[PDB]
C-alpha cells in the first residue's frame, strides 16, 4: 500500500493528484457511485466571462466545493454542472474598450455581427482562464459540459420562460420614468441601481417664478436638480397646505406658511393666507423660455408636497421625475423632453445644447442670477445613483421600456423568501427582504446588441403582440422560411418577421435585448433545456437544496433566480442560501486591478498549494462578513496545517516501510494511554466537525481539525517517536503503528472537503482508494474518553507553565532540575498517572502535588505611604525599614492576624493598620512560580554540582550520538570512543559513566589528554574532541 513520500513542492503534489483524478474519472465516479442515494441539489452561479479571477473569486468556489464534497461523503448525490455568464453590459463594455470604440453609433459603424463575434471570442478566452483557475483550485464542477448563456438551447429555454410570462399578462411595454445610464444609453433595473449608490454633493436652488396678470409677485419654487428647470411645465403645491403671500421690500413672494421664516430672511410682512387649493390655476413665467409648453406653466395640486423642507412649491419636469410625469399627465399638461439619449441638451435648449445636463449645473445657477430669478442656493450631500458598470451618474429619464410585472406577485415573492434558510440569518429580512418589500417592476429591456433578444414581435398595423416560446413557434408564425439553424441573437432574429394573427400585417421584433440578470436567473430551467429536453432530470434537480455566492447577489443572482422562478412557476428555486462576504486586501480596501491590490490566486496556488489557500479562506475568518486577506495567512496555513500533515504522513510511511508494518496483518497490540488519548481526540474532533458542517459552520469545523492536528504533531507523534525508532515489533510499537494508521486514514477523510489534494494523497497511498469516493467517518463513541482528554489538557497546561518558568530563568530543558511542585485546589486530575510524562517534559527529578503553597512561599512586608504617611510623620521611613526587617514568621503572622506592631530604634513601639502594610508573597529561596489561577507551578531553580554535571553528561551523550550519525555507522555497532576535554567534562563523564553506557552502545570509553585527527564538537560552552576507532 504505502509507497513513499518524496521531496516535492506543493504544486508538484497537487499536479500529480490532479492527474490521478483525471486517469480515474474520480469526480465522475463520486457522482455516479451515489446513484439511488438521496439527492442534494446544487446550482452553480455562473461567473461572468469578462475578466481574470482574483482571490475573492476563490471564496465561493471553495465553499461550494466543501459543501458538495461533504454532501457526497454523507450519502447524497450532488450533480454539479458548471455555467458561464456571457451576455450583457459586463461583456460589451470590455469589448468596446478592446476595440477602442464607445457608444451605440460606433458599434453600428463597426458592424453588429462583427462586434458580437468579438464578444464571443472574448468570452471564450475568459471562460478558459476561469476554467483553469477552477481546476487548479480543486473545485469539482463539470466544465466539460457546462451551460452557457449564449448557447441556442439556453436562449430557447429563456424564450420559453419569457413567453409563458407574456401569456400571463406580466410582460408589458410602457413609457415610464426609469433610471437611465447616459453613457451606456440604456435603462437599468432596480437591483442594478441598488448596486451603484455613491455619496455626492450638489446644489439645490430656490427660484422666483413671476405670477402672471400680477406685478412684483413671485412664487418661490424649489428644486434639487437645477438642470431640469428649462423643462419646467408646472409648479406643485399641496391643496390642504397653508401658503402665504409675504411682502419683502419691493416684491411679494408666495411660499408655504410653515417655511416662510426659513425662506424669507432679513425682513418680511405676511399680507394674506391662502390654501393650496386656492393657488391652483394661477399662471407664471418659467425661468427659461427656450422650450415652448403649449399646456403648462400653471400651478397644480399634488399630495406628495411637504412643508417639512423647501418652499412648498415644487418645480415639475415631467420627463425627469416619476411624480412630475404622473402629475403633469393627470392635469392634461404636455410632456416635454430636452435631453437626448446621451444625457446631453437637445436643440430646444440653445445655450447648453450638446452638454451633459449635470455638468451644466453651475452655469445654470449663474444664468438664473442673470435673469434675476434666483433666491437661494444650498449644498446637498446625499446618495445618488451611478451605473454599476460604466460608473457614470445615472439620470431619471422618460423612456419606453419592457417590464416584467414582479409587483403583481410580490406577496408570493415574500412567501417564497419566507421558506428560505439564509446564512447569515439577517439577510433574510435585512438586505434581501427589505429589497423585496420595496419592489418595483423589473425593467428588462436594454437598447444594446450582445445579449438575449427580447422575443416579442409587434404588428406594425394593430400592435398585437406575439412572443414565440421556441424556434418551432418562431418558424410557425414567420411569414418567410426560417432555417432550423437560426441563431437566437441579433441581428439574425431581427431579420425574422411574423404574420399578425389579427390583421395579417407585418410583425417586427422589438429591438432590445434583456437584462443579463434574467439570463442567469433562468438557469434552473435553461441549464437542462427545459421543457424541450431532460424533463425528468430537471424535476429531480429543482429546487436547489443550496446555493452559495457573494453578498452582492442579494441585488443580483439571488433576486433574479427568485423573480424568474416565482414568475414562471410560482415556486422558490432554492431552499437555502449562503451569502458570502467579499474578500478585501489586508487593509480592508476592496481589491481592484486599477488599485493593484488584487492578489493573483493562481500565483498563490502555485506557491503554497490550493489546499493552503482554501484552508486560509475557510479558517482565518468566517465567510459571512467582509474578509481581510493576505498572502501571509496562506503562508501560515501551509506551514502550520498542510506541512504538518505531510510531515506526519511521511514519518509514518518511512518508518512503516522500514519496520515492515502491514495494516492487513493482525498484530498483538499494547495500546498506551497516549494512543487512547489521541484516538479520543480524533473521534471527538470527528463529532464536533460533523456537527459544525451540518450547520454550514466551515470555520469552526476547520479550527477544530487544526487543533487536533496540532495535538497530533506536537504531542502524540513527538512523544511517541521512540516507538517508531525502536527495533523489533513488540506490542507497543504495533499499537503505535495501528493508532497512527487509523488517525491518518480518518483525518484525511475528515479533511477531504477542505483540502482535497493532500487528503487524497494520504488516503490513497494508505488505502489504495480515493478519499473522495469514501464515506465521511462516523464518531466511535466507544473510543471517546472525556476524563482522559480533560486530564491530558490539564497536563499540557502544567507543562506550559513549567516551560514558561524555565524560559524566564534561562534554564534550558536539557539542564535537569530538582523538583516541580504543583499547587492544586481540587483533586480533579489523577496526577499520579502522568508523573512520568511531566518529569520527562520539564526534566525534573521530582513532581509533587500540594494543596497549598505554605511550604513554597514566604511573606515580605512594606509600608503603604499613600495610606499611612500622616500617621507616622517623620517616622515613616524608619517604620518602613523596620517592616522590611521583620522575619519570615513575622510576615506570616501579619498575614494571619492582620494586626502588627514595629519597635523602632529609639525603643518606641507603633501599631500598624491592615491598610498601612503592603504584603508581598515571594517564592522561597531557589524557587520560581508561574500560575494560571487553576494551577501553580513552583520550579526549584537551584543548581548543584551534581545537576550541572548530569547536564554535561547528557550533552556529551548527545554529541556522541550526533557524531555517530554523521559518520554513517551501523546502529548495532559497538564503538571505541576517545574523548578529550577539560577537567569539568572529565569529572562529569566519570561520575555518570553508567548513564553514558546505558545511552551509548560503547565497547570502550577512553578519556585522553590529546586526540590526533579528532572531531571538535561543542558540549555546552566547552569544546570536546571525539574519535571513533572500531566498527566505524
Ligand atoms: C453568481 C454569478 C452572477 C450571475 C454573475 N455572473 C457574477 O457576479 N459573476 S462574477 O464572476 O462577477 N462573481 C462570481 C462570484 O464571486 C463573487 N465575488 C465577486 N467579487 C467578490 C469579492 N471581491 N470577494 C468575494 N467574492 C466575490 C460573486 O458574488 C459571485 O459569487
Ligand atoms: Zn453605464
Ligand atoms: Zn395586426
Author numbering: 1 to 1032
Q: What do the authors of the reporting publication say about this deposited model?
A:
Mupirocin, a clinically used natural antibiotic, inhibits isoleucyl-tRNA synthetase (IleRS), an enzyme that links isoleucine to its tRNAIle for protein synthesis. Two IleRSs, mupirocin-sensitive IleRS1 and resistant IleRS2, coexist in bacteria. Specifically, type 1 proteins (IleRS1) are strongly inhibited by mupirocin (Ki in low nanomolar range), while IleRS2, which are homologous to IleRSs from the eukaryote cytosol, exhibit resistance to mupirocin concentrations that are about three orders of magnitude higher. AARSs catalyze the formation of AA-tRNA in two steps within the same active site. The amino acid is first activated by ATP to form an aminoacyl-adenylate (AA-AMP) intermediate, followed by the transfer of the aminoacyl moiety to the tRNA.
The displacement (shift) of the HIGH motif in IleRS2 is of utmost importance for the accommodation of the non-canonical A/GXHH motif and emergence of hyper-resistance. Hence, to explore it further, we extensively analyzed the residues in the immediate vicinity of the HXGH motif using mutagenesis combined with biochemical and structural characterization (exemplified for the W130Q-PmIleRS2 mutant in Supplementary Fig. 8 and Supplementary Table 2).
